[PDB]
Amino acid sequence: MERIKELRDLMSQSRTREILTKTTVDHMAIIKKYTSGRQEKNPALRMKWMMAMKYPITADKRIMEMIPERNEQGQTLWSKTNDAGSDRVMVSPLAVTWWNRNGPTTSAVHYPKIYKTYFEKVERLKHGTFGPVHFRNQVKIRRRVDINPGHADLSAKEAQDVIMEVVFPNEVGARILTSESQLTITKEKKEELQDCKISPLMVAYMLERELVRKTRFLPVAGGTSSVYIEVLHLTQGTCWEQMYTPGGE
């Protein structure tokens, strides 16, 4: 109901009607990236400079109807002045902390299921067992190794169709996945995330990260396993070796 209604409201005004009519689907990306905002050259300097202002961050308009304009002593939490090239409003950082102490609460039980990679890292480290540190010269030789320890033996494009069919089943188009490994992955990640309401985009991004294999060139000495490379900073050094066995093994 609503969606077509703001569609009609947009088409009511002449300029947006022209934009909707003359613009083709292919140009979607271009106009979506059409912005006057330059990409910052020195982010640290301005982040240290903007945070000294009042209302340094930006938030959706809806914040004006969930968080009061001021806190107990009267420190303002949000302003009604919109951003430069968006309908979002500039708000103070307190509106963040406020949201974490009296804002609406939900059931975050499914975030562990979504962010599978990070929670698997935590579980692997929690059950790890350290050993003695041995001091001897390490011959670090540079090798190509896979960093992602949960890659399902799929490439970027190879798993992209799987991700769409898992999250966006209707926009798949011609592709119907042939490999049965992809079939089982789709089934599992479909039944697992059937009602998760985090965001389609973040779900797709994390599925891409988990399933897609990624490789990088690093100086290693021993190890060479996927689980042993994520902790390469902790097990191998310039003149010391720290024996380690992740919780998985």
DSSP lists the bridge partners of residue 82 as 89
Subset of residues 40 to 79 that bind RNA, contact rule: CB under 7 A: 40-41, 46, 49
Site for RNA in 73-112 (CB under 7 A): 81
Query: Interface with RNA by CB under 7 A: which range of 34-42, 94-102, 106-114, 145-153?
Result: 34-42
Longest dimension (CA), the chain: 75
Instruction: Please state the closest distance from residue 194 (CB atom) to other proteins, in A.
Output: 13
Quickly list DSSP for 130-161.
EEEEEE-----EEEEEE--TT--SB-HHHHHH
**How far is 236 from 220, CA to CA, in rounded Å?**
8
Q: Pick from 22, 38, 126, 157: which binds RNA (CB under 7 A)?
A: 38
Residues 6 or more apart in contact with residue 233 via CB below 8 angstroms: none
Token duo for residue 110: 């499914």
What residues from 65 to 94 belong to the interface with other proteins (CB under 8 A)? 66, 71-73, 75, 83-88, 90, 92-94
180 lies in the site for other proteins, by CB under 8 A: no
Residue 33 within binding range of RNA, rule CB under 7 A: no
Verify binding: residue 145, other proteins, rule CB under 8 A: no
CA-based nearest residue to 131, from 242, 11, 8, 246: 242
> Under rule CB under 8 A, which residues in 150-179 are in contact with other proteins?
160, 163-164, 167-174, 176
Contacts to RNA by CB under 7 A: 36-38, 40-41, 46, 49, 81
